[PDB]
Amino acid sequence: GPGGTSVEELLEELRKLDPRVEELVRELVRKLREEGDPDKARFVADDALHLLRQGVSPEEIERHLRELLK
Amino acid sequence: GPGGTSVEELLEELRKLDPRVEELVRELVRKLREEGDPDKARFVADDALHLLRQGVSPEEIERHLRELLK
Ligand SMILES: [Zn+2]
Numbered sequence A, B: 001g002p003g004g005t006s007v008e009e010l011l012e013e014l015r016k017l018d019p020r021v022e023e024l025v026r027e028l029v030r031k032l033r034e035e036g037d038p039d040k041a042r043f044v045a046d047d048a049l050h051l052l053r054q055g056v057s058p059e060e061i062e063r064h065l066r067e068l069l070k
């Protein structure tokens, strides 16, 4: 459905905290949209923002996101 | 795909921290599985666990999860 949190807003907030995490998440978002799941893309970006706000390293963020994508 | 983080493990961890949040998440998980998106259910449970570990109130958790479900 339309509406809800903006994936672009989430990506924006990631960029302000760590562009390295924004870059890895933007790539996952692009692939997930191509597989036809924008909501999954939004969950991934939202999750990365929670973890980055708590000081999780980019590599640990990526590992965590991959497990939710299996 | 099979594998990845267990939704039951997440629900278990929610219950240990606040059974009120486990209960509201279990209901969302049941509905999301019925709509044929178990991965969405798992994202919701994982998100609730991050927020509950940070001290977010059950009502604020529910509001946040709903916005990701729009
Ligand atoms: Zn929607």
Ligand SMILES: [Zn+2]
Binding pocket: A046, A047, A050, B047, B064
């Ligand atoms: Zn969230």
Ligand SMILES: [Zn+2]
Binding pocket: A069, A070, B001, B002, B003, B004, B039
């Ligand atoms: Zn899977």
Ligand SMILES: [Zn+2]
Binding pocket: A047, A064, B046, B047, B050
């Ligand atoms: Zn997570």
